[PDB]
Design a protein around this ligand. Structure first.
Ligand SMILES: [Fe+3]
Ligand SMILES: [Fe+3]
Ligand SMILES: [Fe+3]
Length: 308
């Protein structure tokens, strides 16, 4: 049996854990928390950690652990299972990207069509969208978007975008609130994440929704995908079962368990989500370096500088 430090949504972690125990007979104990806190605990605990695997919603959090020599190598064959073009790879082969969530524009299709949408996420923060674009400045994925903009286009462009949203956008407290605002006709469009829309669509049925999704694609900063993944702890004295779990998460069956439980994009090419997601490859996500704590501190300063 193994212990998994879990930073991923509980529905996902519980679903893949269950499917692992059913397929192998090996029991999984999840110890759940914030990935940043969990990684900190794994560094503090060092070679005394009871964690066998670290399952996360953000592969960027592996960087420090890899740098500290705390992660074990994974099989190159396992890594290749999810190694589609654009998917982050561990240079030391000591973690694996498993799935993704995407930035998206949700819009009221009875007020706008795709003809009204922008080819760049930058263009939603302009006077054409005054009073007509929702955004969630407090959300984690919004912060990831800002980091991506700074990296891809520099600070002036990112800051200008944030100023644009301050002047032209409508602020919402949460992604779910922004989605309901579009559904209820308060705002014709909003910047959110994909899984919110697909959850609403799976629950209520798409024929009963006013809102649809527009994907900017072509490696625009607005096509940003955030990657979930797993790693085995070097300190684990149960390498065989830890590696079996990670191998399982990258297998067809493990990916199937994940996508049934949550509307993330599988990174296997041969699995299809029952949420009716398009293939990962079609998203055309940009290639962006992992978010560091420094990246985040700096994006927070841009948000403040912009009046948000
Ligand atoms: Fe969240
Ligand atoms: Fe989220
Ligand atoms: Fe959320």
């Amino acid at each position: 049996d193994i212990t998994v430090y879990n930073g991923q949504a509980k529905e996902a972690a519980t679903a893949v854990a269950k499917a692992f125990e059913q397929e192998t007979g090996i029991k999984v104990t999840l110890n759940s928390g914030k990935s940043e806190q969990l990684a900190g605990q794994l560094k503090e605990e060092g070679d005394k950690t009871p964690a066998d695997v670290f399952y996360t919603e953000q592969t960027a959090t592996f960087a420090d652990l890899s740098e500290a020599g705390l992660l074990a190598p994974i099989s190159e064959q396992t890594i290749q299972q999810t190694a589609q073009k654009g998917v982050p790879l561990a240079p030391k082969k000591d973690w694996i990207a498993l799935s993704g969530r995407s930035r998206v524009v949700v819009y009221d299709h009875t007020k706008l069509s795709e003809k009204d949408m922008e080819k760049s996420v930058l263009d939603y923060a302009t006077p054409k969208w005054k009073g007509k674009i929702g955004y969630v400045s407090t959300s984690g994925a919004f912060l990831e978007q800002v980091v991506a903009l700074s990296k891809m286009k520099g600070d002036k462009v990112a800051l200008n975008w944030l100023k644009g949203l301050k002047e032209n956008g409508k602020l919402y407290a949460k992604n779910s609130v922004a989605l309901q605002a579009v559904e209820n006709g308060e705002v014709p469009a909003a910047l959110i994440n994909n899984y919110y829309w697909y959850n609403l669509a799976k629950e209520k049925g798409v024929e009963n929704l006013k809102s649809r999704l527009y994907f900017v694609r072509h490696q625009d900063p607005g096509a940003l995908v955030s990657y979930s993944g797993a790693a085995v702890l070097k300190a684990s004295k149960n390498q065989a079962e830890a590696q079996k779990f990670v191998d399982f998460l990258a297998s067809k069956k493990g990916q199937e368990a994940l996508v049934a439980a949550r509307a993330e994009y599988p990174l296997r090419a041969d699995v299809v989500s029952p949420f009716n997601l398009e293939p990962y490859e079609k998203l055309e996500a940009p290639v962006v370096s992992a978010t560091t704590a420094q990246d985040k501190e700096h994006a927070i300063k841009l948000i403040e500088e912009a009046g948000l």
